[PDB]
Design a protein around this ligand. Structure first.
Ligand SMILES: *[C@@H]1O[C@H](CO)[C@@H](O)[C@H](O)[C@H]1NC(C)=O
Lengths: 99, 50, 49
């Protein structure tokens, strides 16, 4: 409900180190491909970071309703970008519960 | 073993088939049938039907 | 044996690290790619090198 937004500008972006930074499976992009990100380039890149439940990862997609997608984080229909999601059971989980 | 799920080892076996241009050396389990002639029948010659 | 981040590189028409310098598949490739996790057999607490 209070997701951060970071502006990335005036720099050179290397997308090969993203795999080394975090242990995720799929670099699921929509308007582009993950293998062609290093050739062409853009104006500005914005990074939005938040934590959800594993049921609601599928709701982070253009043109879809639900609970996160309607009241927490809505993506536009003309979304050009990539969604990167990975499990966080070792850092964001406690035996007494998380609040 | 303490790494994330994206950094785990993965055993990969790639099976690479080539389409039939030579006579077939490997074929799956299918019982053959005696050849007939001069009749409108369904045939199956090395995997292609008709 | 590859890493889990680079299983998707074993596909026709892919680049990266394995697909460019280690193991490249043809564009007209017919066949099957089989991958399974081997954490129990190919990992050590001190590091499998
Ligand atoms: C994340 O940053 C901390 C602090 O600099 C560092 O100790 C840690 O190794 C970093 N993690 C990765 C995966 O580089």
């Amino acid at each position: 409900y209070a997701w951060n937004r970071k502006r990335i500008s005036n720099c050179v972006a290397d997308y090969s180190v993203i795999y080394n930074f975090a242990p995720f499976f799929a670099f699921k992009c929509y308007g582009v491909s993950p293998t062609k990100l290093n050739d062409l380039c853009f104006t500005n890149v914005y990074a939005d970071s938040f934590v959800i439940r594993g049921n609601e990862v599928s709701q982070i997609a253009p043109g879809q309703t639900g609970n996160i997608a309607d009241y927490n984080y809505k993506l536009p229909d003309d979304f050009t970008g990539c969604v990167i999601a990975w499990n966080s059971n070792k850092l964001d989980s406690k035996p007494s519960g998380n609040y | 073993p303490t790494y994330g799920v994206g950094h785990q080892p993965y055993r990969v076996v790639v099976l690479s088939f080539e389409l039939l241009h030579a006579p077939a050396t490997v074929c799956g389990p299918k019982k053959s049938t005696n050849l007939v002639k001069n009749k409108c029948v369904n045939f199956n010659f090395n995997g292609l039907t008709g």
